[PDB]
Paper text:
Recognition of viral RNAs by RLRs leads to the activation of mitochondrial antiviral signaling protein (MAVS; also known as IPS1, VISA and CARDIF). Activated MAVS triggers rapid production of type I interferons and proinflammatory cytokines. It consists of an N-terminal CARD domain, a proline-rich region (PRR) preceding a poorly structured middle segment, and a monotopic transmembrane (TM) domain at the very C-terminus. The N-terminal CARD domain of MAVS is necessary and sufficient for forming active MAVS aggregates.
Residue numbers in the entry:
A (entry chain A), B (entry chain A), C (entry chain A), D (entry chain A): 370 to 462
The structure:
């Protein structure tokens, strides 16, 4: 699990611009691995810094909690970002 | 039962906009197939994301539990959404 | 008995707003035709959905059990809703 | 901790021109040791006086709050100022 998650997080970082269509506020409802604290912090970050800058923090926070990749794949599908979801599933395998 | 429920769930998904008048909070009292856990989660989803986004999760959760279509038909009738109820009964047959 | 009960239940449904003063929690002590299960369910419904919405379920549940109209007339009198009690007796005759 | 922070703050002051590429508005999202009050004041300072002059106040404010050097190193990395981040880590050790 660790190897696979680390690899996926590394891939998201190197390919960040693939993920800049992701809207932090829209994706949060599908990420139950994030705590209430995480969600409030990310909302504030978004308010202060904008969505693009917050995406980095979203990914950084996701990778700390447990069971993030499955939910991230789900969340991407929930937002109709199927190619992105498939690209994540592919790296996580 | 499985074939009929899967078909009804597929129909609800393809015809989602038919069901966007459904109010999640109003319909919950008629859905005893949902666990207390399901109801609390759906309430939270509604709080965080709004009714429309929660409807998707409502339908997704309903289809997992047992005996959901009958109660969903009942719940639609309970909320005076008779045409919608009939449309569901029609697909479930 | 069936014809008379069905007629009374139909009348309660068509004239629901006449009965919205009825307090579910206050009326339960006078309804021994309801099972312990019925009472617990109705309490929960009341907790989740409020008295008005629960009244519909109260009437729906009453009509299934046996010997409900007599006790319902009694229960209305027990709650000092004499005109309502008389209106029910009148339809049940 | 005090000795190390004081030394780092002294180094930032003596080597201020190394840090004049730092953009106050860009760095604030990575400085959770700053209070909401601190952030509003620094924004105003920036509006009235420009980024260079505000950097002095940024550093002066950072050094008062607790746990500032770690976050400052983080914030420099967040803004892709890796050599600067490393230079701070080096002095703080």
């Amino acid at each position: 699990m660790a190897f696979a998650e680390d690899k996926t997080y590394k891939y998201i970082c190197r390919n960040f611009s693939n993920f800049c269509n992701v809207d932090v506020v829209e994706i949060l409802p599908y990420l139950p691995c994030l705590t209430a604290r995480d969600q409030d912090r990310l909302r504030a970050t978004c308010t202060l810094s904008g969505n693009r800058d917050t995406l980095w923090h979203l990914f950084n926070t996701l990778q700390r909690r447990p069971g993030w990749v499955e939910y991230f794949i789900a969340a991407l599908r929930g937002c109709e970002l199927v190619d992105l979801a498939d690209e994540v599933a592919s790296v996580y395998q």
